[PDB]
């Protein structure tokens, strides 16, 4: 079932009616839904708001949209480049001689072609298979429980997306008929972003500061039809970033959001000094390449272990505003609420599978073993972009030059040449194999 593609097309009809006595939401693969996004005002300060969007379920718990969501103005004029390329036209109106409908159809086909490549790689690589089995199917438990969510509900805002029908009289898509398990949502870069940006976010966050160990589905803003050049080692051998590797990087951040280990913050809601190494978060170095931490692999592994230790145990500071609540205290406090309460076997198994914990039937309580919660955090960092690049033989940064245009078109649907294959992926990262964009400035 890993990355098994549903029979779903760009033009497959959106759900307009639902009869629970003869239909299952599990069989619904094209529907109106809503997800949180950061929206920006004219000043450029962000607030989290729901946005309606049309979703395609391309595989169990994996959703894509062709909708470019309105998150405010980018603040950059059309076709200006600053490393990244900005255009308000991409997936909103005619762009590069392609209609909106053409662009949306191509975006759908291109994302499916990328996932067909990943399915072929799962069949070839135990490591890639293990990664997709985890991000596609893992149980995702968020806390605290929100709004009208019962303490024993499996599906909620952290791990499912709403199925909305239209109010017949007003035509507004605001009639919720249920929800569907969600692990991964892939959408185009929103209006506020450049068209070359790739960005992974927590799919759902409550109003408070996020808690370590509280998971959500992840949303990736990603468009495989564009990429940016990169310089080799510290020579001048230039090549194009492979979008299939860019998405694997973002989905690795994704796995960290699914477990609630991506974004450690203190009681003031700021990143603690121990989470950063000008400044780069440890979350970025462990997603990119362990070896960037130190030339000696054993020192890299030790600094990794110290970071995971603080994610797990938190840290008490002499300034209590800088203290961090760890995964162990957050998860054990959450599960300790259930001590002595009768719960369904379905909710019991959901929690057991999510955190790798056991349940004591006699005392009706979760057994929250420290070694199990440590493994939950450690397991989140089992793979990085560099490992993917070695398995797939994709060229990436080893990681401001005046070497001209940064942003390139990528012919994912093979209109120009044999550019992208479902078995081999991107057949060349050479810049002369791709079409440079032409920024006005
Ligand atoms: Ca970027
Ligand atoms: Zn990253």
Curated annotation (Swiss-Prot):
Zn(2+) binds at residues 249, 253, 284. There are seven antigenically distinct forms of botulinum neurotoxin: Types A, B, C, D, E, F, and G, but serologically this does not belong to any of them. The active site is at 250. This is Putative botulinum-like toxin Wo. Signal peptide: none annotated. Residues 1-441 are annotated as: Has protease activity. It comes from the Bacteria. Disulfide bonds: none annotated. The chain holds residues 2 to 457 of 1336 of the full protein. It comes from Weissella oryzae (strain DSM 25784 / JCM 18191 / LMG 30913 / SG25). When overexpressed the N-terminus (residues 1-476) cleaves rat synaptobrevin-2/VAMP2 between '89-Trp-|-Trp-90' in vitro. This releases the cytoplasmic domain of VAMP2 from the synaptic vesicle membrane, which would prevent the assembly of the trans-SNARE complex on the membrane and thus prevent vesicle-target membrane fusion and neurotransmitter release.
């Amino acid at each position: 079932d890993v990355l098994e593609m549903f029979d779903v097309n760009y033009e497959s009809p959106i759900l307009e009616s639902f009869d629970s006595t003869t239909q299952s939401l599990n069989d619904v693969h094209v529907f109106m839904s809503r997800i949180q996004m950061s929206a920006y005002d004219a000043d450029g300060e962000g607030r989290i708001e729901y946005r309606n969007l049309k979703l395609y379920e391309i595989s169990s718990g994996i959703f894509i949209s062709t909708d470019r969501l309105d998150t405010g103005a980018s603040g950059v004029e059309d076709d200006h480049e600053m490393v990244d390329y900005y255009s308000s036209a991409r997936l909103t109106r005619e762009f590069l001689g392609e209609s909106l409908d053409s662009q949306k159809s191509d975006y759908f086909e291109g994302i499916k072609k990328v996932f067909s490549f990943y399915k072929n790689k799962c069949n070839e690589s135990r490591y890639i298979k293990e990664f997709f089995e985890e991000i596609q199917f893992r149980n995702i438990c968020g806390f605290p429980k929100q709004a009208g969510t019962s303490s024993t509900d499996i599906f909620d805002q952290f791990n499912s997306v709403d199925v909305l029908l239209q109010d017949p009289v007003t035509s507004v898509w605001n009639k919720k008929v249920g929800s569907k398990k969600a692990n991964i949502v892939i959408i185009p870069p929103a209006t506020n972003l450049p068209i070359t940006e790739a960005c992974a976010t927590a799919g759902f966050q409550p109003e408070g500061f996020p808690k370590l160990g509280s998971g959500s589905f992840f949303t990736v803003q990603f468009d495989p039809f564009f990429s940016t050049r990169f310089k080799a080692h510290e020579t001048d051998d230039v090549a194009l970033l492979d979008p299939t590797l860019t998405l694997l990087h973002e989905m690795t951040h994704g796995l960290h959001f699914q477990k609630g280990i991506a974004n450690p913050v203190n009681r003031s809601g700021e990143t603690p000094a121990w989470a950063t190494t000008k400044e780069t978060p440890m979350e970025e170095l462990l997603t990119f390449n362990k070896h960037t931490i130190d030339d000696d692999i054993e020192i890299s592994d030790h600094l990794k272990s110290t970071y995971i230790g603080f994610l797990y145990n938190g840290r008490n500071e002499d300034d209590p505003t800088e203290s961090v609540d760890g995964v162990y205290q957050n998860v054990s406090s959450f599960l300790n609420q259930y001590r002595g309460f009768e719960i369904s076997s379905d909710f019991q198994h959901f929690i057991e599978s999510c955190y790798g914990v056991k349940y004591n039937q006699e005392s009706k309580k979760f057994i929250v073993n420290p070694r199990n919660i440590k493994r939950y955090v450690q397991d989140g960092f089992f793979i990085d972009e560099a490992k993917f690049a070695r398995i797939l033989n994709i060229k990436t940064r080893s990681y401001p030059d005046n070497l001209g245009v940064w942003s390139y078109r990528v012919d994912i649907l093979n209109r120009l040449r044999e550019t992208f294959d479902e078995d081999r992926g991107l057949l060349s990262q050479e810049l002369d194999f791709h079409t440079a964009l032409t920024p006005v400035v």
